[PDB]
Design an enzyme around this catalytic site. Sequence first.
Site, PDB file in Angstrom:
ATOM      1  N   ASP A 164      53.013  33.582  36.804  1.00  0.00           N
ATOM      2  CA  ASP A 164      52.727  33.111  38.161  1.00  0.00           C
ATOM      3  C   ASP A 164      53.735  33.782  39.174  1.00  0.00           C
ATOM      4  O   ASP A 164      53.839  33.306  40.313  1.00  0.00           O
ATOM      5  CB  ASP A 164      52.978  31.571  38.213  1.00  0.00           C
ATOM      6  CG  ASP A 164      52.221  30.657  37.246  1.00  0.00           C
ATOM      7  OD1 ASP A 164      51.580  31.183  36.302  1.00  0.00           O
ATOM      8  OD2 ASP A 164      52.287  29.404  37.426  1.00  0.00           O
ATOM      9  N   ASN A 204      43.728  30.202  34.293  1.00  0.00           N
ATOM     10  CA  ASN A 204      43.320  31.016  33.139  1.00  0.00           C
ATOM     11  C   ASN A 204      42.871  30.174  31.947  1.00  0.00           C
ATOM     12  O   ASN A 204      41.930  30.556  31.251  1.00  0.00           O
ATOM     13  CB  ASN A 204      44.399  32.012  32.737  1.00  0.00           C
ATOM     14  CG  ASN A 204      44.650  33.074  33.778  1.00  0.00           C
ATOM     15  OD1 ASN A 204      45.112  32.786  34.881  1.00  0.00           O
ATOM     16  ND2 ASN A 204      44.378  34.327  33.460  1.00  0.00           N
ATOM     17  N   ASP A 215      56.828  31.944  43.091  1.00  0.00           N
ATOM     18  CA  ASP A 215      56.106  31.372  41.961  1.00  0.00           C
ATOM     19  C   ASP A 215      54.880  30.662  42.496  1.00  0.00           C
ATOM     20  O   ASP A 215      54.970  29.919  43.475  1.00  0.00           O
ATOM     21  CB  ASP A 215      56.979  30.435  41.121  1.00  0.00           C
ATOM     22  CG  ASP A 215      56.222  29.616  40.093  1.00  0.00           C
ATOM     23  OD1 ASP A 215      55.903  30.166  39.019  1.00  0.00           O
ATOM     24  OD2 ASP A 215      55.972  28.409  40.356  1.00  0.00           O
ATOM     25  N   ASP A 236      42.712  36.824  37.148  1.00  0.00           N
ATOM     26  CA  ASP A 236      43.032  38.186  37.574  1.00  0.00           C
ATOM     27  C   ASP A 236      42.544  38.457  38.972  1.00  0.00           C
ATOM     28  O   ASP A 236      43.186  39.218  39.698  1.00  0.00           O
ATOM     29  CB  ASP A 236      42.398  39.231  36.632  1.00  0.00           C
ATOM     30  CG  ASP A 236      43.109  39.473  35.314  1.00  0.00           C
ATOM     31  OD1 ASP A 236      44.121  38.768  35.033  1.00  0.00           O
ATOM     32  OD2 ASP A 236      42.635  40.325  34.544  1.00  0.00           O
TER      33      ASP A 236
END
Lengths: 153, 154, 154, 153, 154, 154
Positions: free
Chosen positions: E77, E42, E34, E51
């Site tokens: 994540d 974002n 993670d 991205d």
Amino acid sequence: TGLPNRRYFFELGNRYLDLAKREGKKVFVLFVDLAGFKAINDTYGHLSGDEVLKTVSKRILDRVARSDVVARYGGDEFTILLYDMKEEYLKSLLERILSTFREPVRVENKHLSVTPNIGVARFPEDGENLEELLKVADMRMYKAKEMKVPYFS
Amino acid sequence: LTGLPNRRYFFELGNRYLDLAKREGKKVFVLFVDLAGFKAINDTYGHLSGDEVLKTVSKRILDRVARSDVVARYGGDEFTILLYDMKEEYLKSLLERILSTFREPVRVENKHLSVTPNIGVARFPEDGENLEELLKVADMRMYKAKEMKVPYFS
Amino acid sequence: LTGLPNRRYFFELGNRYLDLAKREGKKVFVLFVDLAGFKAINDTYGHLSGDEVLKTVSKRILDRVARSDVVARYGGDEFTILLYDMKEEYLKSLLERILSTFREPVRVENKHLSVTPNIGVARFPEDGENLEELLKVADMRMYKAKEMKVPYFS
Amino acid sequence: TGLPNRRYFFELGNRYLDLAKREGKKVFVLFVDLAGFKAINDTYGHLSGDEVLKTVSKRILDRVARSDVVARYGGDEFTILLYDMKEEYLKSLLERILSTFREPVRVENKHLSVTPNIGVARFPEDGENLEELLKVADMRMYKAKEMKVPYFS
Amino acid sequence: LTGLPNRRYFFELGNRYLDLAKREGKKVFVLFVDLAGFKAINDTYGHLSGDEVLKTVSKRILDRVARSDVVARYGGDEFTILLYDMKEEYLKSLLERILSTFREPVRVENKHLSVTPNIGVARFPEDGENLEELLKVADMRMYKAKEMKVPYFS
Amino acid sequence: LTGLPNRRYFFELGNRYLDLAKREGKKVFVLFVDLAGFKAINDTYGHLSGDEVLKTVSKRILDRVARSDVVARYGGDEFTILLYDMKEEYLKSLLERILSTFREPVRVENKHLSVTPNIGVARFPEDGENLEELLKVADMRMYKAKEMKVPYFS
């Protein structure tokens, strides 16, 4: 400058010679010519050339003994009279006087340069009066001047 | 600024000069110049004024020594001069011309600041075999001159 | 740490030595020592290895010159040596003893590193009146030696 | 880079060894070589090669402990000193340092690659001073370099 | 984009790897990676930036695993790594090398974006008999690591 | 040349020593040594004399501390000593041996120069977490000792 003139130098001078004659002593007569001075007044004017003369006088006065006679002859010229002094005292005095003029004179925002040329005469050897001794000293400073050396004794 | 080298440079050049003198069978004079009145100059007029005096003092020494003579600032009121293979006559004259130069109070700004010179001389080999020894003898002799109120001690 | 002085120190001492020679009427030899094979040593073994070789090279030069001789590192593969008032015999012998020292591949770690010496000589006053002039003549002469595949050129 | 030089490394280094001698502790000396660096400057210039050195330094600095001594030796070389650390800490530190250099360095619009080669020496086993330990570490990084492996301890 | 496979692919390959391990009498490590700081990336810089970070993260994981190791993106994540028959030493080293890459803030455009890694490990057979079970144990262990402010939990 | 490091070296080594002590769970003593009589020495005998005293003072401290103890010159009448993980007994003895050395007036040339020592002590961690903090506590404590006409304050 406060410095005495030719006429005063002559009166004191001859008395010093009269005294030396009687006491059986020598007298040194120095003829100091400060080259670069005719160029200073003809570029910066009289006040600047006069301020240089005031510094030159004070510099000579501070380096001679109390009993030594300093006077200004004329233009680039000064005369110094040493009564009964050792040759060692003379060599040292000449060195200390020459050393002062290596330092360009600061007048205003200007840094003016004078070059010293000294001629020496000795009483009695070189003459019996001040006029004779000064001419020998003047001849010897001119020999020094043309030879590009500082002093001639 | 002065442009003048420091203690560390003086020491390297100094010892080389001594190594050279040892081999060539020559003498070396080491002068220790102390300019009294300087500690009072900074404490009254500040660093810039004190520094401007140091710049004039340096130029005055530099203009009077020979091209092959080593001049450096030791620290504070102190300057060192090294004379390789020079006659005693040259030294007596050099001392006179240096002393004569400091009779002239230094002009910094609108001020006329006074410094008094005190010089001590040491001779290699007589006074020592290294620069540290010679400087100590010269420093002792300038301190003798300083306390005696005379200009120089040889 | 070689302990050896730099270009800046060499120049100050160098010119003083020349000033002294001018006055005393003596000659000065300026040697330009280039150690070929050194550009390859660092590109292969790294800086520590190349530096350890520089430390050995320095000690080797230092042990073979007289106490009054000035040794310094110029830069990269280059070292400079200054000889004040030495006989031509002393120079021929010094060059032979220095060249002999580098025939010995330098032992750094488990490595046996090889450097080839190339020396150029200049003489003061004949070759120039300052250190930069003499170093350029000496550098020109070491490069003549280098291209000629000979050890030295005087 | 902000990173200290050879001279600083040596002073701190020997003090660390003096301290280890007294406390009865070990010291690891890492010799880090970044291959590809001589090619970077010979192609992209000093600024590019220097920007890579700045990234390399920050990458090492971020991965060592506060008490670890990092310095640049010279050229493609960096030295790391570990006072009293477990062998586990060393194996992990080597892995984390090698992992960073797998990432080609981004300088401008360029993606520049350096390969890490690390040699390890242990005080007292490998030597009693920093000069000795660095030579053992340098020999071991060169063994690693020629063997095409990342590290040799 | 990342070229990296998805949840559906991971599951098919994953279970086959487990079937193979069951038969050969080998262990399988399942890593749940993670990357904290990603939800903030974002929501501040947008999808393209988020991205581009995912593309760098993927390449970084891909470059550090063995050819036979299965890497896939789980969801947000999240990334999953499958290690077939590897020593515990290989795992400790792989975790260290992965954590080391994310200490380096990601450069996307004129931005320097930071992600923090949190990894949970599960071992087949000990932790479960299928990929869904192992991922939940690994997910629980990464969440223990996340809340404990430590990098990994095995 | 004392050979002794300066303020900036002391600070780098100093903080590393503190970082190391933090990790190992050890104490560090920071000594602030002031030598009264030194400002009067340079103002009377000059820099060379004051410097020769500094060279003797340095060698005297250096000869009495352990190999792992950090000695440096702070500035003017001041020296700093750093003791990593030493017993309080070692400190009491070190202070006594340092004070004992300055009871003997320093011999520079034909002079017998006197300096009086004032030492302040700080302990890491109790007195502070960095070298700047510890030096200020030690400096405050040497000043307490100085005004109280006592040799040391811990």
